Amino acid sequence: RKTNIEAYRDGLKLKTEEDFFACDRQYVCQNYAPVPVVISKGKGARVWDINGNEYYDFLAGVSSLSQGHCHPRVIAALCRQAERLTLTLRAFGNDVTGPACRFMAEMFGYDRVLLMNTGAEAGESALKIARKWAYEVKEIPPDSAKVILCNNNYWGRTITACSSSTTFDCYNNFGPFTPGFELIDYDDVGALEEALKDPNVAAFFVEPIQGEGGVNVPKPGYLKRAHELCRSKNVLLIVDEIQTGLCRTGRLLAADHDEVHPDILLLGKSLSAGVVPISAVMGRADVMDVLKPGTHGSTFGGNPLACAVAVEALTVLKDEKLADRAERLGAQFRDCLRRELYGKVPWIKEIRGRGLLNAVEVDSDAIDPNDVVMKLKENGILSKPTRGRVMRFIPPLVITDEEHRDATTRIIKSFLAVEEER
Amino acid sequence: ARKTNIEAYRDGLKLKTEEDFFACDRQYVCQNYAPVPVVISKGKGARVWDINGNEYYDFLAGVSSLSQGHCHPRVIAALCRQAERLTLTLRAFGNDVTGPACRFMAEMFGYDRVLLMNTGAEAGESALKIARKWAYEVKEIPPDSAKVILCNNNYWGRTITACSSSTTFDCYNNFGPFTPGFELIDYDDVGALEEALKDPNVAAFFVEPIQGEGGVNVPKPGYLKRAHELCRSKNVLLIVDEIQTGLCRTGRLLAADHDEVHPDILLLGKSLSAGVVPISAVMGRADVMDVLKPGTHGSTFGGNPLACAVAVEALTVLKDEKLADRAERLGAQFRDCLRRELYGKVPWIKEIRGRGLLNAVEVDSDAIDPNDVVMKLKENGILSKPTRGRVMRFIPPLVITDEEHRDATTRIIKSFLAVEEERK
Ligand SMILES: Cc1ncc(COP(=O)(O)O)c(C=O)c1O
Ligand SMILES: Cc1ncc(COP(=O)(O)O)c(C=O)c1O
């Protein structure tokens, strides 16, 4: 049986990529840039376009697809639960949400788990928790709570996220803005310490490696020291692991590189293996319990379908030893690129990353960075930069040794060819 | 059948009674919901079963997220077929589903452009961003001056900006400081709206056709029609939140259709996916929606192909099963019967109200404990969660059969009479 989207699409008689591009222009809100490919299918580290051409996916949902596209275990868990029960609301109990929260609480070492749907919602929820905790436990004056975050942070697209962004296109013309934020440079202990002098600070909200900001890896010991400074002042450390967590950087959490156990942890993206939107906020009881009944909610948060998917997605990370995989392959990737491209390619500014969260920043005054993106695609690598000039290499962690060797050589080949053509 | 992973996992926990699940929940789940009465394990159509095999009619239905019923076979089949092929690309890449699904929606609802988000709060956030950016760029109002009018007792979600525009104490208390830019007026009051619309800095009026969480507040006939005229007069966008009222619930495709109103910006959610996965939509004319240029808005999962395939199937069910007609017919019967068998007989009922299958019975909490009604309903096989304590809600799947609806209506009336007997 053809399902309705298949049948409706068939009737539209879309043959070429351009036909699909035209369909976007006409019917899809135009808040994304043009795209170079129309993907029809995904398996593991590979995707295929509508013409059957094969690519490696080196974006992977910006680390939402760590377990690969269409991981059979995760798709079986989705389908079996979907036949049984998908939604009760948290107004009613069910036989999945509590067990899934227990599973997560034990895996990550927290007392309480709040399940939301998107990463932005996890961030919003964490800010709300930190504010309410500041008022009720720290006893700071009404409406005075402040939250410190860093320049170039990214946590989503709500108005409060826009209000705390330093990125022009994220905030421009979307005000007036939510107050209560203090922005400081990333990777700067001094600036943090000075900001923490304000007793009305509730939290410091930080990424262990800035994602959208350009795969900005801080100096060794940054997060470790930040947590000490925060604790000195009774300020919560909220660590956004929505992009860096779940084995991507070679550890279960990127915070583990600094032996930091976040006061509040955010997860998202590969929590569901890219199958359905589910995010998490985790914290100790005496923080999370400020969210009393009626004070927060979500229709789909904690729905049993997403919970079943998430438990399976997390178990795959463990069973397939994906943190070890990411560590090993990522170190090989960076060594190969540094050996083969530094010196030879003068318009590479840096090769950086941890695990399989890697970037190559190029000098956009020396090269058109889009020429690198297009060359990569010609050689079978789909990759989307950030900030124009920061090339990103973020494959599924399940990429095989042989696929990763192939991909790495296609990657080298592409940078070298761009240099040759300069 | 062979055990599923999650079944085996929980089997390892030895959680067997409703009270073991209640304890599990108390210990590991963030405690932002009230205690629950029941542990549901299976849903099908208008029915659910608890872990002991007891059957109930679900009269909450996800607050109108399950209009197509639990586990609709077509929608599962669509989920599973698409899930085997592709679930997520990001909108950074194209795929062969998102554009077609947006065209499908654009044509069904009569809009130029469709923005797909994940939750109803995200749809609201997105619409407010669009309205503000449009007011700055097209209306040329002073920078940072954009205002949005909303109504007292509105509900649109739980983001900080939503909390900043709420009049409900537990929704906002101790979550500030708050996003500025909102003007709060009484619902169902055209004179208050007209006066608020005198301010040229207003970008939008954001309103529910029937207030949902605020208590199934049905406005006077012609409220929304008049509101639209007043907004147009002032070049103010009418943002209509159909997340709870839309998609056949009230006996029409959109609740706005009762007033022959085509929203300037439409919000959908909830039953857009038949309760299977979170997907929401913001739709609008080109000259409004096109302010959202590349890089100015985004979402990881928004527009993912899996959710798109599910939504197209869910929307088609509404049509094919003539669920607007079913809701209209059964809902009219429900209100007739309850009024006829409860008013007078039961002194502590204040009002029976609703449209289609979005119905409520507001009780006098000074004269009765509303929770006694909730518990009596469950004893009689009806799962129902009130809003604001005293507003009992009756929101079944629209696929409820004539026989199931008759049975349920008789159980509901029986429950209210029983509580009254006990009061006497
Ligand atoms: C670190 C981080 N936090 C939060 C978010 C927002 O997640 P979502 O797109 O699911 O709202 C993202 C998205 O890329 C992210 O990279
Ligand atoms: C009218 C209305 N709008 C928005 C929302 C928020 O949707 P969500 O819970 O998906 O964030 C709801 C939730 O019930 C609603 O009733």
Residue numbers in the entry:
A (entry chain A): 18 to 439
B (entry chain B): 17 to 440
Authors' text:
Ornithine aminotransferase, the final enzyme considered herein, is an enzyme involved in the urea cycle, TCA cycle, polyamine synthesis, and other pathways. It catalyzes a reversible reaction allowing interconversion of intermediates from ornithine to amino acids. Each monomer has a mixed α/β structural fold and consists of the cofactor PLP-binding domain (residues 87–336), an N-terminal domain (residues 17–86), and a C-terminal domain (residues 337–441). The dimer is held by 3 salt bridges, Cys96–Cys96 disulfide bond, 63 hydrogen bonds and 782 van der Waals interactions. The cofactor-binding domain of TgOAT non-covalently binds PLP molecule, i.e., PLP does not form the Schiff base with conserve Lys286. Similarly to homologous OAT structures obtained in complex with the cofactor, PLP interacts with Thr135, Gly136, Ala137, Tyr171, Trp172, Glu224, Asp257, Ile259, Gln260, Lys286, Ser315, and Thr316. Most of these residues are highly conserved among TgOAT homologs and represent a viable, “druggable” pocket (SiteMap score 1.03). One 1,3,5-Tris(4-carboxyphenyl)benzene (BTB), polyethylene glycol (PEG) and acetate (ACT) molecule were modeled to interpret additional electron density in chain B. TgOAT appeared dispensable (fitness score of +1.2) in the tachyzoite CRISPR/Cas9 assays consistent with TgOAT appeared to be expressed predominantly in the oocyst stage (ToxoDB).
Toxoplasma gondii is one of the most significant parasites that impacts human health, with estimates that as many as one third to one half of the human population are infected. The enzymes selected from the TDR database as small and tractable for expression and crystallization included: phosphoglycerate mutase II (hereafter referred to as PGM), nucleotide diphosphate kinase (NDK), ribulose phosphate 3-epimerase (RPE), ribose-5-phosphate isomerase (RPI), and ornithine aminotransferase (OAT). The genes encoding these enzymes were cloned, proteins expressed and purified, crystallized, and crystal structures were determined.
